[PDB]
Design a protein around this ligand. Structure first.
Ligand SMILES: *Cc1c(COP(=O)(O)O)cnc(C)c1O
Ligand SMILES: N[C@@H](CCS)C(=O)O
Lengths: 317, 317
């Protein structure tokens, strides 16, 4: 019976929904934590809020300053949302691979977007990571909050996301499956949940062509938000019990199944995480429960996996 | 805490957020009820659910049947969401004016879409309303729930939306502003809230070129979801204290202000309702409160008012 003082107060406390068709072949029950209910449309609202609010409280930033962030889109949106509400200028650097819908959301939130060449490595000089550094050196009173190293990324999940999981399931939860990009979600959740229940299994989903979950070959893929060519400082792989390597076709196919068979209007990496869970949860028995993190909404992919012509062009239909 | 058995259980109980910048010239305080948090992205999830569940309980429809609905998109999405979860085939008839994003969401939920000419009058043989009737006469086991006349449209707001408003505000609410399409939202809310507090003011927002809030001239406009060339049976204009006539330019400008200055990722008719509220709420004094219904998400308009190229093409930028 509470009124929210601003839109940032609606971040978090996201619904968990039972999966009723896709997990038909499992012994366990299967559930999804629906991060698309966040006001910016993704899990990254949590870390945009936490990084901005902690930095402001500590005196690292002040209203009127500029926040510069390299992003695949969602963290940019989370920071842009916090900046629109709290009074920060926001600049995003984003590879051309990321969807146009992300750029339009960013623009309407007041962020300025610099698009960079898709294929640049994390250290390549024209990359979004490098361009952000050049911008910070040239723009007075600017800051790169840096989701890849800022502890307020995993901390948002240790104190927030994982607390919600504890509140919803208690000890009656046996596995959590999460796609891994920065690693903040899986690391914050794994650390908190294993303190609470050391028997819980933590499963990462990592695309083929990423090194986070093993391997050395770097290769591009269409799924957005998961996988990297370097290990982010916030990722603690020692807390992860297993990785499942995912692929574009199965990710987008499973995402379409989530929409059509569960009515969940989700994104591409949601299909990746769910597909991984449909493999990994086979280790659970009757009466056990598996939770999958679903990071974002279909909105970011209307012109991509949600579009039949794009799917056929890219070999997924 | 709660685990939801399916996505339909997350419909409703939407946040009310204080408006902190746009209402700075008002004496009163200003608030927004954020219907874009519904799982289908709009207020119409409420009536898609209510119409399906009540018709099924009454024996008018049964799982496996086909539901055919004329819609501007959002009611179609709400019915498609219910149909995906509960097992109904869904066919939508929709004017060409409505966004491509709405059609893509409908298609991914498994619905079939028939597009009809924008300029057809509601009773022209080729309108979406007329086509739905022709399809129902031909397709076995098909039914039109009919949001324009079905009492479970306003009933969903009388028993649901309006109860939530009472729960959040009690007697400390003095005006509600809502755009009018079918009139189900404004009628169900007005009926319930005026029983609870007869002094509350109910303000409708109606586009220029619609007859709902007065006038006789029919003219096309780009804002989606509000205004019509006929009076829907569910609309009770005797419950509305005043209408404000809205226009595309002010609607899209105010929608862009809501996104940029409040971080509310809303749609075009949200700008219309908010622009109307910024006029009508001037009658309120310090210590009074005005609530604006915000019907849907920016997702439905990414290629339209949220896109600078579209705005330039249509003469708004
Ligand atoms: C339908 C709708 C409205 C108006 O709601 P009604 O209950 O039909 O009067 C306003 N905006 C949008 C986007 C809608 O879909
Ligand atoms: N994590 C993947 C690759 C192993 S290195 C797997 O379990 O097959």
């Amino acid at each position: 019976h509470m009124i929210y003082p601003n839109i940032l107060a609606t971040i978090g406390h996201t619904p968990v929904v039972k999966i009723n068709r896709l997990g038909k072949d499992l012994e366990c029950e299967l559930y999804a934590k629906c991060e698309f209910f966040n006001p910016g449309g993704s899990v990254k609202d949590r870390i945009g809020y936490e990084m901005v609010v902690k930095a402001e409280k500590e005196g690292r930033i002040k209203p009127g300053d500029t926040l510069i962030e390299p992003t695949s889109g969602n963290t940019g949106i989370g920071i842009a949302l916090a900046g629109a509400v709290l009074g920060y200028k926001v600049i995003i650097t984003m590879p051309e691979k990321m969807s146009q819908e992300k750029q339009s959301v960013l623009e309407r939130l007041g962020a300025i977007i610099y698009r960079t060449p898709t294929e640049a490595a994390y250290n390549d000089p024209d990359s979004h990571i490098s361009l952000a550094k050049k911008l910070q050196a040239e723009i007075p009173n600017s800051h790169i909050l840096d989701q890849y190293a800022n502890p307020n990324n995993p901390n948002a999940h240790y104190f927030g996301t994982a607390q919600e999981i504890i509140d919803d399931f208690g000890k009656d939860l046996h596995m959590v499956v999460a796609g891994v990009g920065t690693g903040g979600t899986i690391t914050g959740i794994a650390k908190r949940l294993k303190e609470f229940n050391p028997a819980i299994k933590i499963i990462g989903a990592d695309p083929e062509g990423s090194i986070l979950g093993g391997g050395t070959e770097i290769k591009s893929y269409h799924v957005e938000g998961i996988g990297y060519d370097f290990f982010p400082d916030v990722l603690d792989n020692t807390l992860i019990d297993a990785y499942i390597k995912t692929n574009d076709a199965d990710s987008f196919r499973t995402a379409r199944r989530l929409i059509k068979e569960e009515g969940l209007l989700i994104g591409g990496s949601c299909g990746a995480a769910m597909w991984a869970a449909l493999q990994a949860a086979k280790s659970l028995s009757k009466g056990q429960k598996c939770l999958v993190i679903l990071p974002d909404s279909i909105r970011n992919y209307m012109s991509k996996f949600a579009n039949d012509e794009w799917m056929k062009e890219m070999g997924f239909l």
